[PDB]
Amino acid sequence: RFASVYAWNRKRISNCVADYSVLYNLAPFFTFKCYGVSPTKLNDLCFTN
Amino acid sequence: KVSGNYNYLYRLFRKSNLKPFERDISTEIYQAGNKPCNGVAGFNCYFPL
């Protein structure tokens, strides 16, 4: 279950390395467009938080 | 232009880096997925301009 829009939850992730193979491989995903960086360069960067 | 000047374009993806003063304009479709993408842009393959 997800929280409602007006009371959206925020989940904090840190102290781990993120793998983006599975996010792009999920069937029911319709749109994904990233402005600041290319969608394919999520695994060659360091995330402060 | 107030109505929107869209005759100027750039790119968001290229297959490889280029040498200085390079000379060609190839506007072929660019893909990101392992499977080849041909014809129209689809999943993991989008219009590069």
Q: B44-49 contacts: CB < 8 A, separation 24 or more?
A: B44/A24, B46/B13, B48/B11, B48/B12, B48/B13, B48/B14, B49/B9, B49/B10, B49/B11
Name the token pair of A7: 């009371």
Name the token pair of B12: 């968001």
Number of Cβ atoms within 10 Å of the Cβ of B32: 14
Nearest chain A residue to B14 by CA distance is: A38
Mind telling me how many Å the CA of A39 is from chain B's nearest CA? 10
Resolution of the deposited coordinates, in angstroms? 3.7
- Give which of A15, A10, B16, A9 is closest to B30, Cα–Cα: B16
Mind telling me how many Å the CA of B24 is from chain A's nearest CA? 23
Which residues partner with B30 through β-bridges? B46
Backbone angles phi, psi at A22, to 5 degrees: -75, -30
Cβ pair B33, B44 in contact under 8 A: yes
The experimental method, as deposited, was: cryo-EM
